[PDB]
Design a protein around this nucleic acid. Sequence first.
RNA 1: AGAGAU
Length: 86
Amino acid sequence: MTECTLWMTNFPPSYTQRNIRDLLQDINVVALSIRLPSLRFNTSRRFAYIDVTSKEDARYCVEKLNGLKIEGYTLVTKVSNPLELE
RNA sequence: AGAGAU
């Protein structure tokens, strides 16, 4: 309840800025901003960062795609460092 | 893996 930013790693570009956002905003409620840090050199190391409205949403995203084997790659969808511990 | 380039 204090974070909101997810980290997305290893995954075919099926997930792109708009699709990750569509998935995030509908499956997860509006992704405020999706950071595509890689993909500038080339489609290599496609990892991203996505921003969500509060966490129910972000926490939702990591739950939905983490551990997904897509095209032979296991997705590493994770949310920010948990600040809802205590 | 867990940091913002586009």
